Chains A and B, each alone.
With several copies, the nearest count.
Chain A
């Protein structure tokens, strides 16, 4: 039952419902966390 349907689509990963804008915003947030404290205040 699970093997061969949505339960294996989940194993496939982001083939069905998965959004681009949220992923891009998350990557931007991670980069901002990485780089914000080292940017100058000027």
Chain B
């Protein structure tokens, strides 16, 4: 339909339109009954209690998508070319992009082959030149995402401050990324946003943490997501070694936003900072949530 478009950008850069307007132009269409495609799989936890079981929390699980495509052409040689190109568009080690475009925008999922594809019918595929490939792909990162929102604040003063507007319009908490120039001592916000995960929801409402004093040439990236180390210098200096066990603890909870403050001190040149706010969603399409 014209309300939904599904595309695949392979690991080699090939572009396919499985469903939607212009689907099947490259020879591959999407068969029905695709699973674990819409909602992010989450399992909830329960402890024994006096009234049965008590809620203990939730964990989001990786997506195990199983879907069939149909590769077709008029002649078997061109069908063989199409099938080979489709196979080349996938890999186990590196992930290809799967984009869904609706009136809510375009959200992409990074997927890799979980196991070998299951191609063709019972007979040889050159008889038909129109054969299905069943594919079991997996999303290690299970959330659908959009292009992150980026803001830049530069200054020439030795000491300065700024406000970054931030707002999570998605379904799930997002983890902020910072890029900070050197030299200079930065103070970055780590607001709880009312999140009570550490039982400090309103104690950490205005939490600010000071990064270690960066030496010349030691521009740092401070990624708060748990997949990656928090502090990483671009010159290879061990910055987090000088941070005494400090860390950024809180994601940007959904529906929360404010003018988070960034402070720069002891910057003789006057540095710059960049804030990246990811746009993660648990669904290929969803109306914005206030």
Contacts and interface: CB of A to CB of B under 8 A. Distances in A.
Contacts, number: 7
B65 to A, nearest CB: 10
Interface residues of B, number: 5
B67 to A, nearest CB: 11
A3 B66 CA distance: 10
A33 interface: no
B128 interface: no
Majority secondary structure of chain B interface residues (helix, strand, loop or mixed): strand
Interface string B43-70: 0000000000000000000001010000
Contacts of B36: 3
A17 to B, nearest CB: 16
A20 to B, nearest CB: 22
Contacts of A2: 35, 64, 66, 136
A3 B134 CA distance: 15
A2 B36 CA distance: 11
Nearest to B118: A3
Interface string B75-101: 000000000000000000000000000
Contacts of B136: 2
A1 B64 CA distance: 12
A22 to B, nearest CB: 14
Contacts of A1: 66
A22 B89 CA distance: 38
Nearest to A3: B35
Interface string A1-40: 1110000000000000000000000000000000000000
7 contacts: A1-B66, A2-B35, A2-B64, A2-B66, A2-B136, A3-B35, A3-B36
Interface of A: 1-3
